[model samples]
Target: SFIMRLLNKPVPGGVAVVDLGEEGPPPRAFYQGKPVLVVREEGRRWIAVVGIPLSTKPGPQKLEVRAATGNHEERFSVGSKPEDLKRIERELAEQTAAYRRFSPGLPSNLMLDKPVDGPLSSPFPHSGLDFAVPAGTPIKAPAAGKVILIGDYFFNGKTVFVDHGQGFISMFCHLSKIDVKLGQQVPRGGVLGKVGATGRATGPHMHWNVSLNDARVDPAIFIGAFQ
Candidate 1:
């Protein structure tokens, strides 16, 4: 399960790689009504790569699996939840659209560098990274990507969404300023913004969220910093 070690964290705000069997032509899987990413592993078995949302509560989660033989359901678990709700319900509707964006191009790299060269703090479990930087500290992109979205979300504040192609994306939030424009191509270490307490934050901090297959996962996984 080398792929599992690399990507399948399986907690809320993490990635879940569920096996679909070794003999099929390939299968379809769905979570939260969204189609998921399916890939062949080591030329052996097919895996449904699912991204677990940070706001999802801990418990049994379901995946609708459709194969050539028949259709069935797969069960997964969300060991915990992340912060936010209420106005989040509204803000989520806006941000969720960005998360759902998918490009046919594969991600440039699965292993990513830190967006900011600063200390790390796991604020909401496997959801993302929080850096202790001053308001004007520059925040860079973890990997090469295109700026797919830019917004001033309620909970996220000023946010920049970068798509590393396919369904893999990176989000930086709570910024004092955004340096990249929507649809702009950014290099791996290009600056995206400056850290600040914009949205619902208490003070200046840099928050980075990494996603795959439409699921907001732990940013630490890509940076080899997951606990």
Candidate 2:
């Protein structure tokens, strides 16, 4: 109940939670023709959790909901960075290109497994989930996926990007070692790397990012840890 309530922020860079009802079969929801993240809430009702892109504007939005009975519509509304240098810009472009990659296959799992065992940092709305795991802690794949990209950049050192099909992606950053290579198929819980203080990080931790339809959304939504 609280998970669905806390994540219902319908704003740019936020998640839109639309109720699907309690008595019917689970329904599929789409936004802009892309399948949105749908989940069962407290085993009581289904919800469509939409990830609004950071570039989205505050205005009217429509969700195409398809159910076994028939189709439905939900009208919603949206309530509402940084620079380094030329090299930084280049890195961002490359990363954004990778994020844009989408496959037809559906994601293996939506409720992600925690990549590392540790307490999460206080909820940060704009950034990815941060786990305060120690150095040398092996980072695991939150879900089964193919390694779409890997690199050591200025900020995200020894990073790896796991494509969980569609536009869903999981990014592991600031690792001490990358266990998988590009194009490798990683099973759920497979080791991706070891947590460490790399890149611009101040200390050992696991910084994870989740992307949906090319938009960077909060990882806590998938882990049932949303605030």
Candidate 3:
């Protein structure tokens, strides 16, 4: 009962395997008194790859197994060290601590004179680079292109879409000023707009996006400088 008191959940969406040494009529597995399937594999390894339901806690837990010899108990885990967690809690300290209507999203698309300074925050491609800048910052085309769209939505307000052909497309949003119009032809680095918090923005920044084969992608990935 005390064990249930502390860990209310086990890791989910991970695989758990049991290594049965050289032997037996395949095998059968049971978890928390329920039956789990088993399979026989090469090298004489018999096991099961259990998929823990998002609602079930982590396992590599103890289970009952049956073989040619008889029924016996075995231990399994979702790729973890069993001894690690009876000590899972440390003599520790407390740690101190999106958008509906977003038309796609805005990313940091920079054109600068000076070396960029400051560390980027978490998990790459936050899908797109959000290069925090003041509203009304100028936005430039990453390459030569034809403007194909100029529109607005409740999300990312005041947007521009440009087609750079060969299966590549680009977009810009959250502008206070848009200097180009739909169907306009321009050279590389032409101004598309000035950034703003026109829609779905807290302050101001330019969001840029690139797509290939109709799939939207982060410019930060294919664009060499930022990659």
Candidate 4:
């Protein structure tokens, strides 16, 4: 089935269709200190698609509504058990053959250390390279900027996206642990998280990819950019 092929990654923003079964003003929502978009849908129902940020702790969460306001908020299951994340990731991988793409010859990180140590388990992608590391290995940032997003998906288990300014972005995937928070600042070579086999993997390793101008590019080019 096509659904089987698609890798169902973690919700970039956990979307929930909050059906109040009523119509009102332009309702607003807040979650994890960020604004959750609310809109009116069919059946005169107000739907709120809330996001569960990756920085959230794995357990329970709450959503506060500001549309009707007097005494009304929603409590929905925020996340899954440790093993459940694995199941969702597997389903999503079957969904897509690929994700990020990259380009080369850009001036970037010139002295980036390999995220992990081990063997080359798979052939390099057309743009980025993959390093074979055991599970529970340590993973660090290639350069340092803003923590764009951290998530778990089917293709890559625990994933982290870092913006290196201008449109240069770097990603670390198949991680076992994520230590940073959303919108947090990090220094170059800072510890982001540990590598793990969180997604579809036989063992453990680090999947590193980069993007330039939204186009997937070779991260290797930055290996000598600072020099």
Candidate 2 regions with alpha-carbon error over 4 angstroms: 1-12, 17-49, 54-59, 63-74, 78-84
Worst 10 residues of 1 by lDDT: 78-87
In the range 1-227, model 3's lDDT, one tens digit per residue, is: 22122211223422344555526555665555544434444325665433333234444467677776777887755432134432323211100000001122111221221111222322221334455666766777776667767766456678777655433456767789889987897666777878788866777655665543233433443333333
Clashes of each: 1, 0, 12, 23
User: In model 1, which residue pairs have backbone atoms overlapping below 3 Å?
Assistant: 51-215
Better of 2 and 4 by lDDT: 2
Expressed as tens digits, the lDDT of each residue in 58-138 for candidate 2 is 999898989888888888888861446888888788788877777655566767889988889745444688887789999
For candidate 1, the per-residue lDDT at 161 reads: 92
lDDT of 1 by residue, 119-167 (tens): 8876554367787767899888877989988988777899999988757
The predicted structure with the larger lDDT, 1 or 4, is 1
Pairs clashing in candidate 2?
none
- What's the lDDT for candidate 1? 0.79
Off by over 4 Å in 4: 1-111, 117-127, 224-227
